[PDB]
Amino acid sequence: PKAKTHSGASKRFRRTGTGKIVRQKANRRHLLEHKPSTRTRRLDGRTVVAANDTKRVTSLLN
Amino acid sequence: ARVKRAVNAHKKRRSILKASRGYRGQRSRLYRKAKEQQLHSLNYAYRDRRARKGEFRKLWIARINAAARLNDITYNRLIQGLKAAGVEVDRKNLADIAISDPAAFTALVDVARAALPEDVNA
Amino acid sequence: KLHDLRPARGSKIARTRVGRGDGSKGKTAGRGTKGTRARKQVPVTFEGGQMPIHMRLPKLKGFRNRFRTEYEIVNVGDINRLFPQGGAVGVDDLVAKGAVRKNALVKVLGDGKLTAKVDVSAHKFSGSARAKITAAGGSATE
Amino acid sequence: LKIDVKTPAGKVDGAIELPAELFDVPANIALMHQVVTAQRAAARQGTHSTKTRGEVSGGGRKPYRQKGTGRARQGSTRAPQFTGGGVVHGPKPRDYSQRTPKKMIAAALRGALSDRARNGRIHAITELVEGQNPSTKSARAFLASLTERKQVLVVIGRSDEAGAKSVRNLPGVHILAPDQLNTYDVLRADDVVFSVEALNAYIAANT
RNA sequence: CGCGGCACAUCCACCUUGUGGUGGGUGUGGGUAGGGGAGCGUCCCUCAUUCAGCGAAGCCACCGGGUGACCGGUGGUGGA
RNA sequence: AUGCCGUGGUGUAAAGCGUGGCAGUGAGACGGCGGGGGAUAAGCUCCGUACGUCGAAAGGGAAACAGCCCAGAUCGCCGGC
RNA sequence: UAGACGGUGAGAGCCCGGUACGCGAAAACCCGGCACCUGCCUAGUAUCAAUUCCCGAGUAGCAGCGGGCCCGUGGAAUCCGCUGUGAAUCCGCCGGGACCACCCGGUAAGCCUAAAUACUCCUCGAUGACCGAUAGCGGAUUAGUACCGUGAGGGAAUGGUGAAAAGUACCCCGGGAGGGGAGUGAAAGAGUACCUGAAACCGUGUGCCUACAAUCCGUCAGAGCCUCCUUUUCCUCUCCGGAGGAGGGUGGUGAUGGCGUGCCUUUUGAAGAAUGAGCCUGCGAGUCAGGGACAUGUCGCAAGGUUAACCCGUGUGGGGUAGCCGCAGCGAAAGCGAGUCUGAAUAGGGCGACCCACACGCGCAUACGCGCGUGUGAAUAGUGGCGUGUUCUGGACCCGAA
Predict the structure, then answer these.
(1) Kind of pairing, strands C72-74 and D152-155?
(2) Separation between Cα atoms, residue D99 and residue B67, nearest integer Å
(3) Which residues on adjacent β-strands are paired with residue D153?
(4) Number of separate domains in chain A
(5) Chain C partners of A11 at a C-beta cutoff of 8 Å?
(6) Which of C66, C91, D85, D151 has its CA at a distance of 20 to 30 angstroms from the CA of residue D15?
(7) CA-to-CA dists, residue A10 to A15, A26, C63, angstroms
(8) Which residues of C touch A53 (CB under 8 A)?
(9) Is A60 in Cβ contact with C61 (below 8 Å)?
(10) φ and ψ at B49, to 5 degrees?
C-alpha cells in the first residue's frame, strides 16, 4: 500500500550524488591493535558497492 | 464476465475426435485417449514419411536386383554399369521399366555389362 | 471519430497469462522447480543464513542533525541566463520566474560568471557568489 | 477559424471567428485514444464481486480426516476446486478510472474539436428553440436540417428554453454543457452544434 | 546434394538511402528449465457497418482452407 | 608433452566486454584418459580433463538398449551420394 | 417537456402499463410560520493603589512497579494505572523531551457542548463492460429446508411445454403404465418424464473385415470387397440413360508387409512392475488494490512535470499549488559550494562539477590544440499518466496437514 524502506540497510548504505551506493569498508571497529595502519587505511572509507551486491541493496534502499 | 468455457474447448475436442475416427478401442470414443493416440499417430506418420522414402528405395532395390539376376548380373555390377555408362535413371523408374519392359531392362543390363572395366582390380 | 482511434504501436502490450498450456508458459509459469520459489517467494533480506550485506556491514558513521538548515540554491551563471537584463531581482522574483520552489530560504551559488548588471537579494551568499555579483556592477544583499 | 450559423425564422447572423486552440491544434489520435479510454474506464461502476473462500458461507470444517479415507485431503468444503466454493483471483469490486493529467485531457479535447472545425462540421447557433416553449417539432427540423448527419452533439448550456429540454428524445443527439464538454462525446458525435453563448463562454474560459 | 514451400539474423543495391516494404548473397531454423517476439479462440462495452422468423446462437453431418491455435462454406436440427 | 599468460600476424558472424530487466540451476548419469578411497572390486564413491554424450537429441548401427559409434530433424518428394 | 423501461403471438415513441411534465392528501409524522406561557438584568462595567481572602486535594509532585507513546526502562520527557510519602492558590503550580538558571505558552485535580466523521437491520429510487441455475446469497424450486449430530453446531439438492392449456375428446392394444390412429397447435422434430438436446453410456440395422493367430492397439506401403460418382467399348431406342462393365475419382472397411516401449508428475534414468487418472459434461490455479520500488514500450509538457483531500458539474468535466519529485554536491555534522571531506599540506585521495570537424583573439607549438565565453548555433531532462515484466505489504498461483 506504501512501500517500506528496509531500515537496517538504509542506516548502512548511502546513495551518493549520482547512482552509486557507498557501503562502509569497516572491519575497522573492534580490534585495531594487531591491525597495521596499512590494514586500516585499507579499512577507512566508503566503498562503492560492487555489481554482485547492487540489485538487492537498492531494493533494500527502497 | 464469466465465460462458460464450453465452446472454446469443444472446438478442439471435435477436432481430435473427427481426426480420430476409425480407432479400435476407447480411442475414437473418448477424448483424452483420442488425444494420446493423435500424438502417437502423428509421430508415427512423421516417422513413416521418412521411413517410406527409405523403404521404397529398398523395395525398388530388391526388384532391380531380381531383374538383374534374371539377366545373370548382380545388382552391384548393374549399378556400377548404369553409373559408368551414366544413364541417370534412378531405382524407381529403373524398377518400373524392370516390371513392364523386360526388353528395356535387358537393354539396360547389356549397357551395364558393356560398362564394366575388366575385373576385380582397378 | 471513435472508429478511427488507435494507440501508438509500441504500447498496449499483451498480458502474460502463464499457466495456459505448455506452448507458451505452460505448467510452472517461470518457477520451474519444486524448490521454495516454486510456491512462495524468498525475500531480498534472506541470504541463506550467513549475515546479509545489511547486517555484516556497519551502520554509517555519524548522526543526522535534527536542525539541518537546508536551503535552496540559485545559480549565479544561471541567474544570468535567467535575467539577461536583470537590474532588479529578489527571492520572490526567482520563484516567480521559476528558478526555485516556494517556502524557501535561498543561497546563491557561484558556477559561471554572472555578466549581467544585477543586484540580488537572498540569504547566505557564498564566496564566489558575492565575488561575481559584486563584480558584475551590482552587489549582494541579505 | 471562422463560422457562425442561423436562427429559426432567420438565415444568418454573427458569422464569427474562433481562437487558435479550436482549429489548429494538431489532432494526435494517440493522446485522444488514451484519454477517451480513461473516460470509458471512468464510466465503469465496477461492481463485480464474488465470494472468495473466507467469504463463502461455512466451510470452516475439515471433512474427512487427512489419512485413512482413500479420498483426497480436502481441508474445506469451500475449496476453489469444489462447487459453491470460493472464487480464486476473482473479480472484486474494483473502482478503476485512471488519473490522467489536466494537460493531456484538455489537449485531447481541443484536438477533437480541431478535427471537427477542420472538416467544417461545427455548427455554432444562437438558440436552438422556437423561443420559449420547448418544442421538438421545430427543433428536430432545425437540427436535421442544420446537420444532415446522423449523430449530433448540442452544446446548449444551463438554460432550458428549448435546448436541454426539447431536443431530447432525438436519437443521435446528445446534449452537453460548455464545461462538461469532453472527448468521447465530441468524437462519438458527427456534428457539434453549439449555442453562441456556449461557444463564446467556452472560448473565454479556455482563453 | 537435387528440387520445391515457410521462418529467423546480418548485409547491401533500392522505394521516402534509420521507421516499414522490392531484389539478392550468406548463415541459420532439435530442444528441457527458462528468456524474447508474434498470434488463435471464448465472452462482455463503445464506435462503424452488416446478416437474421425468408431463420440468430447452440448442436450434428459433410466439403473445403490456414504453417499452428484454428477458419469458412453447405446441408440437417432449432426457433432469437 | 600438454595446458596456461602475453604479444605478432592471418582466419572466423554476435563470439567478447560493460550495464540493466527476466529467469532458471545448484540431487547429475555413463563413457575416454589422469588420479584418490575400495581389495589390483562394483552399474561404487570422490576428484581433474576448451573431453564426449545423455540430461535436453530424434534418425542409422549396437538383437533389444538414455550415456557406446555415425549423425544434430524447418516442412514435402514413390529422387541421388 | 414523452425515442426511459417493460409487456402484447417477433425487434413497438404512436396497442398496453407508463415515462417527460403536471396535479396529488383526510389523518398521521415531520419541516417550519405567528401569538401565549415561561428565562434574565432595577449598572457598578469602568480606573485605583492591593489592606485581605479565593481560583476544584490524599490531587499534583517525588520514589517503587507497570502500561502507553516512534521511543523495547533506554539517559526520556508528556500521559495513564496501583502502592508509599505527600503540597501550595498567582511572588501558586503546569508545560516547553532528563535537569538547572533566564525567556515563552497555559492555568490540571468540575461538568457540558451542534457541525463536518463512520455505520446499515430497514424502506424508497437507480445503475452496472455484475452472475444468469455447477453461476450469483447456503438459499430462484416449501431453505437455514430435508437430512447429519446428544449438543454446540453442519447443512444440501431441486428453475424452462406452449403465444394461448387450446394438456391429446374419440376408437384401438393393455389389468395399468404405455403406446397407434385421430385431433389441438405454426411445430408433438413442443406430451404435463415437456425450450435447444452435447458427450460418456446403452441398443437396432447395414458395407467391409475377423474363428492358424499375438504384438501401446496406431502409422506407412497396400490387394480386394461395398460406396456414390462418373469418361467411354457400348446400346444409336442419342428424339429420352445407364447395364456386365474398361479408365477415373472421393468414402466405409481393410487381407497382407515393414516401423513402433501410452499421457502426466517427478527423475542420472520411466513403456515402466514409480505417482495420478474408470469415462464423459460442467466447474479448478499466477488476480487485484497502492498519487507503492525497480526496469522498460508508448504519450502528454519542458527546467519542469504533477496534483492529494476537497469545491462546482449530471457524461469524468472544470477549479484545487498543500505536498512529492527534478533543479548541487560534499561532509559525522557545524558548515561550504562546483566544489566538498580527511589532513599540518594540497601532495594525494574519496565523493561530483562539464560536451565539437573551427573559430575571436592570443600563452606556446616541430604538422601540435589544452585554454575562455560569446557562436560556427556548444546539448539535451526530467516529471506525470497508460501498457509490460519483476519485486513489496496484503491469504497473493491453487490445493494439503499434524
Answers:
(1) unpaired
(2) 87
(3) D174, D192
(4) 1
(5) 59-60
(6) D151
(7) 9, 16, 13
(8) 53
(9) no
(10) -65, -50
CA of B39 to C1' of F29 (A): 29
* Residue at B35: amino acid letter: K
User: What does the H/E/C string look like for D18-78?
Assistant: CCHHHHCCCCCHHHHHHHHHHHHHHHCCCCCCCCCCCCCCCCCCCCCCCCCCCCCCCCCCC
Residues after which chain A has a gap (C–N > 2.5 Å): none
Place of cell 485413512: D68
H-helix or E-strand spanning residue B113: helix B102-114
The hierarchical CATH code for the domain C72-136 is 3.100.10.10
Cβ atoms D49, D89 nearer than 8 A? no
CB atoms within 10 A of CB C115: 13
In the numeric block, the cell 516556494 is attached to C102
Q: How far is the CA of D100 from the C1' of G305 (A)?
A: 13
| Phi, psi angle pair for D122, to nearest 5° | -85, 135
Q: Which chains touch C (3 or more CB pairs under 8 A)?
A: A, D
Resolution (Å) of this entry: 3.3
How far apart, in whole angstroms, are the C-alpha atoms of residue A38 and residue C60?
A: 22
| D188:C1 CB<8 A | yes
C108, containing H or E segment: strand C106-108
> What's the one-letter identity of residue C44?
V
Please give the Cα distance from D116 to D113 (Å, whole number). 5
The contacts of residue B7 (CB under 8 Å, 6+ apart) are: none
Deposited experimental method: cryo-EM
Residue with grid cell 565575488, as numbered in its chain: C131
Angle at C115 between CA C114 and CA C120, to 5 degrees: 50
Q: Per 3-state DSSP, what percentage of chain C is helix, strand, and coil (rounded to 5)?
A: 15, 5, 80
* Partner-chain contact D188 C4, CB within 8 Å: no
Residue C49 DSSP one-character state? S
Give A1-62 as a 3 state SS string: CCCCCCHHHHCCCCECCCCCEEEECCCCCCCCCCCCCHHHHCCCCEEECCHHHHHHHHHHCC
